Amino acid sequence: TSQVRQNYDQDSEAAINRQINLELYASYVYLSMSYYFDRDDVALKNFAKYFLHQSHEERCHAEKLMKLQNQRGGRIFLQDIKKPDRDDWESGLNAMEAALQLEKNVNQSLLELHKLATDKNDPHLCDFIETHYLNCQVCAIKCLGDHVTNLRKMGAPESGLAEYLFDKHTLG
Amino acid sequence: TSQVRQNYDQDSEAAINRQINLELYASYVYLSMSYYFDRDDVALKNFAKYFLHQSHEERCHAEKLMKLQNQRGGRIFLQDIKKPDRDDWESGLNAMEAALQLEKNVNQSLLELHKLATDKNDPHLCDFIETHYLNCQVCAIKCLGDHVTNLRKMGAPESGLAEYLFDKHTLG
Amino acid sequence: TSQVRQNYDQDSEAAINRQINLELYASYVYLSMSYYFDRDDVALKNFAKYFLHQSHEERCHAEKLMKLQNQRGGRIFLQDIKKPDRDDWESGLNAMEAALQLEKNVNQSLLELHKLATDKNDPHLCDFIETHYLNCQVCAIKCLGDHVTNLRKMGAPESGLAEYLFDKHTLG
Amino acid sequence: TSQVRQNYDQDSEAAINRQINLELYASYVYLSMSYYFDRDDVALKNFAKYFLHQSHEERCHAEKLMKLQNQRGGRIFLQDIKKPDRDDWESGLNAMEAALQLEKNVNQSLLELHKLATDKNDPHLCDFIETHYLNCQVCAIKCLGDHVTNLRKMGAPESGLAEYLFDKHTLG
Amino acid sequence: TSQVRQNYDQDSEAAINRQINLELYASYVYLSMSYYFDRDDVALKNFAKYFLHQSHEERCHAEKLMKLQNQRGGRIFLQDIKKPDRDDWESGLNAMEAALQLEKNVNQSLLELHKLATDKNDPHLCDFIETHYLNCQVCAIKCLGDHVTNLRKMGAPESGLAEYLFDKHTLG
Amino acid sequence: TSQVRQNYDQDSEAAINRQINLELYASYVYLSMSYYFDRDDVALKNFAKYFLHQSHEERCHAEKLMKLQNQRGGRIFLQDIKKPDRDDWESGLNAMEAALQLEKNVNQSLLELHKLATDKNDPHLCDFIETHYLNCQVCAIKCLGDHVTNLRKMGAPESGLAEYLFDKHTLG
Ligand SMILES: [Ca+2]
Ligand SMILES: [Hg+2]
Ligand SMILES: [Hg+2]
Ligand SMILES: [Hg+2]
Ligand SMILES: [Hg+2]
Ligand SMILES: [Hg+2]
Ligand SMILES: [Hg+2]
Ligand SMILES: [Zn+2]
Ligand SMILES: [Zn+2]
């Protein structure tokens, strides 16, 4: 048993390692989307950038979660990073919609993780999430949603001019 | 025989002069395209500005090639510079496609020139091409590729508005 | 077929996607080592840092490889990121030795990739590697080796004072 | 007909296209002399440097001419750019003598062009020439004239020291 | 066997050591030429200064090569540095012609070394020569070639004035 | 004879030429040592660092000696530079001792040189020796002496930790 461990439950420890992988996954998904728009037949540099940043952000959440693990005394155990669902994300609107779902999912995962920490009376963990992931996911979803909304209302996905202008004005 | 000549094959010497003309040619095409967009009936400054820059760029590659010839003891032999294939390039999309094919042929020419250098066992020549040219072409083509894609997805050439916004946003 | 593709062979394309995963893998391995030293029972912040940077560097190679893919016209296809071998890396010396092998491996993979590009006459690819990965791997190995050497000669792994001082003076 | 054309005669438009070609030609010539001195057996950097600047100048002149065509409503028509009269320019004194002749020829047709505009009662065309070429050309001739005179009086071509010191003192 | 060794053939290893001597040799030659012009009966400070730089340059090339030897895992084996051919270099033109011959021989050696690395499928060793040596040599040669041309043309070595003036203007 | 020669004996001259070689030799010795510690199985940068500097220090001493020869009308006569009597230096301690001896010999050599100068009544040569060498060598030896002392009292060569710490705390 780690000398620093205190009030950190086994389920929580596992829950985290699990959350860690989901984050690494999310990062991989975003990495996949980024380079989809980098393709000469898609060509939307800002979508590409937007997503790559989104990618780097998730890998950062992953690492911060790993830090938490070591801080509490729990041991980290890595699992394969599943490959993303698709390989082709169609249009900018599809990618956004996809991302909106992914976030809503990761958020679902976090809320479950919070309930777990509440049933285990781990105030420190509940807080670490409330401040570092909860309000973050809420802002991410709301943004994604807005993009989805504007893209639909601009004529996308059928309209190629719409995504172009979106890549410029909103993501640029 | 030049006092500095060393391991520089005569076939190689001819290949470069050949390339020095292809480069000068491309420069001429790009110039033609430039001032095409400068017409009061075309009026797309940024396209014109763009192609003028490429015309100036190719012209330099032609010069770097000539410096190379001299460095290695070879002797430069210039030829006429054939007039560009067309006089009117129709639309910005059409011009971009025209350009994409051009840069593709020059790369083609370089890739051949490279095999020739290899066959003649001239590493310095192989290297000079790899660094100063090969990479550039690969990038140029990828950029022209992207431009062609965007203009398309926007509705060009039919949509006069697509070529306008592209000129402003992408090339401006 | 991608409009930008030219002289880019199918085997090469595959070879890359494969090299991409190996890089992502390497990054994961290094990520695993970093947080091993972050553990309160290992406690070597600089080893942790050293490795995390090494981790970020590899993920960067991965992305740059993905860029190449899109530049040449080849399509990217992601594969699961296998999980690292161990979970516990024992000592700083073990981690270094491990890393030395990993690099030597990734380098082996790159050299094979180079021979492939040579058999396919893709000067652009041979070069992209010669300049962005070859000389890089050689410097990485030589460094790792030096650390391994100093750690052995300082009394590690049996000596706990040796690794401590190494974390300070060399990695700090 | 161009929506902007006004008082621009067909003979003039043709004469301009003709003048454009001559300028691009002179440019080639200079480019030629430029890399002549860049040869290891001629080795006169400044002569090289000088003529290169001249080459760029004549090209800048061609572009201005084209810009004019578009402005007045005419239509540019490019023709092949014949190769320089020679490949080897012998000595500095010879090239200076060669240029002097070239600029005078160019100046010649320019005057012809001005005479034409005068007959076609096109005040604008005469004024454009009056300021952007007739003045440059007179100075150009006077300069080369001065150069030739100096080289002759110093010893060229009998003296190799003459060209060397003229390279450093006048052109450097 | 060095833990860092990989795809580094024993022939290459031995070739490198041999080349290391050749470089140190040139350094000694250039050092001999440097002080030759420092003699009161020769008195050409820039010639002296010029060659001293080449001597220092070559030693640097030597050192780099030794670092390569160590980075690849090979082992350095020094040999005697055979003194230069003469003690008197007659004239500046004589010295410049010799140095041209030397760089040309050192370049020839480098070419043989590059073929060996290729024949031994060692991309890293091939590329290392491509950048840090092969390109420098073609340049060194072309410069020497030029210095030799001017000195000739200025009337050397019969004319003492020529070298004095070359010393001040080119090398000064 | 040299117009500048004046009270510079024959034996003195030959002696300096002799000293010049010894200094060059010492330089080659340190060069050897330097790259020994640069080996991946020795890995002691600062030692590598330290000796490489001394190598240059000695080579400079050589050059100033050659400048002396020319300053006084003597003629320089370079000889082969024998390789070091060692390839592998075993340890930092052994190497430091080797250096110490080496320096004492060169000092011994300089002391004999100063003697010759006195028996030949040459105050300039004597003074030259005093201010530019005799004084450096003493300090040098004293420094090398101190280094040996520290390494020995630190537990060298059996303690790898000692040399490692000396490398960081004294040579760093
Ligand atoms: Ca005294
Ligand atoms: Hg809680
Ligand atoms: Hg080659
Ligand atoms: Hg290749
Ligand atoms: Hg007029
Ligand atoms: Hg090779
Ligand atoms: Hg004395
Ligand atoms: Zn807009
Ligand atoms: Zn310490």
mmCIF file of N, CA and C in Angstrom, chain A residues 31-66:
data_model
loop_
_atom_site.group_PDB
_atom_site.id
_atom_site.type_symbol
_atom_site.label_atom_id
_atom_site.label_comp_id
_atom_site.label_asym_id
_atom_site.label_seq_id
_atom_site.Cartn_x
_atom_site.Cartn_y
_atom_site.Cartn_z
ATOM 1 N N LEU A 31 -7.600 13.057 -33.159
ATOM 2 C CA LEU A 31 -6.411 13.052 -33.989
ATOM 3 C C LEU A 31 -6.809 12.570 -35.369
ATOM 4 N N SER A 32 -7.709 11.590 -35.393
ATOM 5 C CA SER A 32 -8.199 11.021 -36.637
ATOM 6 C C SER A 32 -8.993 12.049 -37.435
ATOM 7 N N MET A 33 -9.811 12.844 -36.745
ATOM 8 C CA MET A 33 -10.620 13.852 -37.421
ATOM 9 C C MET A 33 -9.745 14.952 -38.012
ATOM 10 N N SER A 34 -8.785 15.417 -37.221
ATOM 11 C CA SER A 34 -7.882 16.468 -37.657
ATOM 12 C C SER A 34 -7.296 16.160 -39.011
ATOM 13 N N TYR A 35 -6.589 15.041 -39.107
ATOM 14 C CA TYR A 35 -5.970 14.688 -40.368
ATOM 15 C C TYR A 35 -6.942 14.292 -41.458
ATOM 16 N N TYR A 36 -8.232 14.301 -41.149
ATOM 17 C CA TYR A 36 -9.202 13.980 -42.176
ATOM 18 C C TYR A 36 -9.339 15.252 -43.006
ATOM 19 N N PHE A 37 -9.362 16.385 -42.310
ATOM 20 C CA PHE A 37 -9.492 17.680 -42.962
ATOM 21 C C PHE A 37 -8.186 18.196 -43.571
ATOM 22 N N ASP A 38 -7.099 17.481 -43.301
ATOM 23 C CA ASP A 38 -5.779 17.816 -43.824
ATOM 24 C C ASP A 38 -5.610 17.200 -45.216
ATOM 25 N N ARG A 39 -6.469 16.223 -45.517
ATOM 26 C CA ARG A 39 -6.472 15.523 -46.789
ATOM 27 C C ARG A 39 -6.788 16.471 -47.926
ATOM 28 N N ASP A 40 -5.983 16.424 -48.978
ATOM 29 C CA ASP A 40 -6.190 17.305 -50.121
ATOM 30 C C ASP A 40 -7.601 17.272 -50.721
ATOM 31 N N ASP A 41 -8.379 16.228 -50.458
ATOM 32 C CA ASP A 41 -9.722 16.171 -51.014
ATOM 33 C C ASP A 41 -10.781 16.662 -50.031
ATOM 34 N N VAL A 42 -10.338 17.095 -48.861
ATOM 35 C CA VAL A 42 -11.229 17.637 -47.837
ATOM 36 C C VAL A 42 -10.809 19.101 -47.714
ATOM 37 N N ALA A 43 -9.517 19.288 -47.469
ATOM 38 C CA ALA A 43 -8.883 20.596 -47.368
ATOM 39 C C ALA A 43 -9.550 21.681 -46.543
ATOM 40 N N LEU A 44 -9.510 21.546 -45.226
ATOM 41 C CA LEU A 44 -10.083 22.543 -44.334
ATOM 42 C C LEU A 44 -9.111 22.736 -43.178
ATOM 43 N N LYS A 45 -7.992 23.397 -43.452
ATOM 44 C CA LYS A 45 -6.965 23.610 -42.436
ATOM 45 C C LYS A 45 -7.422 23.965 -41.039
ATOM 46 N N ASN A 46 -8.399 24.853 -40.914
ATOM 47 C CA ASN A 46 -8.851 25.238 -39.587
ATOM 48 C C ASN A 46 -9.617 24.145 -38.873
ATOM 49 N N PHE A 47 -10.380 23.341 -39.605
ATOM 50 C CA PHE A 47 -11.079 22.240 -38.960
ATOM 51 C C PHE A 47 -9.966 21.349 -38.451
ATOM 52 N N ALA A 48 -8.994 21.114 -39.326
ATOM 53 C CA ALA A 48 -7.848 20.288 -38.999
ATOM 54 C C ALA A 48 -7.181 20.797 -37.718
ATOM 55 N N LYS A 49 -6.933 22.101 -37.669
ATOM 56 C CA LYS A 49 -6.305 22.712 -36.512
ATOM 57 C C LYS A 49 -7.227 22.595 -35.328
ATOM 58 N N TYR A 50 -8.454 23.081 -35.469
ATOM 59 C CA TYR A 50 -9.412 23.000 -34.379
ATOM 60 C C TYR A 50 -9.346 21.629 -33.722
ATOM 61 N N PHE A 51 -9.528 20.583 -34.523
ATOM 62 C CA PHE A 51 -9.498 19.222 -34.012
ATOM 63 C C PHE A 51 -8.178 18.771 -33.419
ATOM 64 N N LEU A 52 -7.061 19.172 -34.020
ATOM 65 C CA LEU A 52 -5.771 18.766 -33.482
ATOM 66 C C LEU A 52 -5.582 19.358 -32.087
ATOM 67 N N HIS A 53 -6.043 20.586 -31.899
ATOM 68 C CA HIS A 53 -5.940 21.229 -30.603
ATOM 69 C C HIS A 53 -6.835 20.456 -29.655
ATOM 70 N N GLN A 54 -8.030 20.118 -30.125
ATOM 71 C CA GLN A 54 -8.977 19.369 -29.312
ATOM 72 C C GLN A 54 -8.316 18.061 -28.918
ATOM 73 N N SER A 55 -7.520 17.519 -29.835
ATOM 74 C CA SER A 55 -6.811 16.268 -29.603
ATOM 75 C C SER A 55 -5.797 16.425 -28.489
ATOM 76 N N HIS A 56 -4.931 17.424 -28.625
ATOM 77 C CA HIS A 56 -3.901 17.697 -27.632
ATOM 78 C C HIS A 56 -4.534 17.978 -26.272
ATOM 79 N N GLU A 57 -5.684 18.642 -26.261
ATOM 80 C CA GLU A 57 -6.351 18.949 -25.002
ATOM 81 C C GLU A 57 -6.742 17.681 -24.271
ATOM 82 N N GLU A 58 -7.323 16.728 -24.992
ATOM 83 C CA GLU A 58 -7.724 15.474 -24.376
ATOM 84 C C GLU A 58 -6.534 14.682 -23.846
ATOM 85 N N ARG A 59 -5.444 14.616 -24.606
ATOM 86 C CA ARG A 59 -4.276 13.886 -24.131
ATOM 87 C C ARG A 59 -3.779 14.525 -22.850
ATOM 88 N N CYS A 60 -4.029 15.820 -22.701
ATOM 89 C CA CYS A 60 -3.606 16.538 -21.510
ATOM 90 C C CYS A 60 -4.490 16.130 -20.338
ATOM 91 N N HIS A 61 -5.791 15.998 -20.577
ATOM 92 C CA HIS A 61 -6.705 15.576 -19.526
ATOM 93 C C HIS A 61 -6.237 14.208 -19.058
ATOM 94 N N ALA A 62 -5.917 13.349 -20.021
ATOM 95 C CA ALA A 62 -5.432 12.012 -19.732
ATOM 96 C C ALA A 62 -4.262 12.080 -18.750
ATOM 97 N N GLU A 63 -3.218 12.824 -19.101
ATOM 98 C CA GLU A 63 -2.049 12.944 -18.233
ATOM 99 C C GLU A 63 -2.372 13.498 -16.845
ATOM 100 N N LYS A 64 -3.231 14.510 -16.784
ATOM 101 C CA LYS A 64 -3.607 15.115 -15.512
ATOM 102 C C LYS A 64 -4.319 14.071 -14.642
ATOM 103 N N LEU A 65 -5.027 13.157 -15.293
ATOM 104 C CA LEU A 65 -5.727 12.093 -14.586
ATOM 105 C C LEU A 65 -4.684 11.122 -14.049
ATOM 106 N N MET A 66 -3.645 10.880 -14.835
ATOM 107 C CA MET A 66 -2.581 9.998 -14.399
ATOM 108 C C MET A 66 -1.861 10.589 -13.183
#
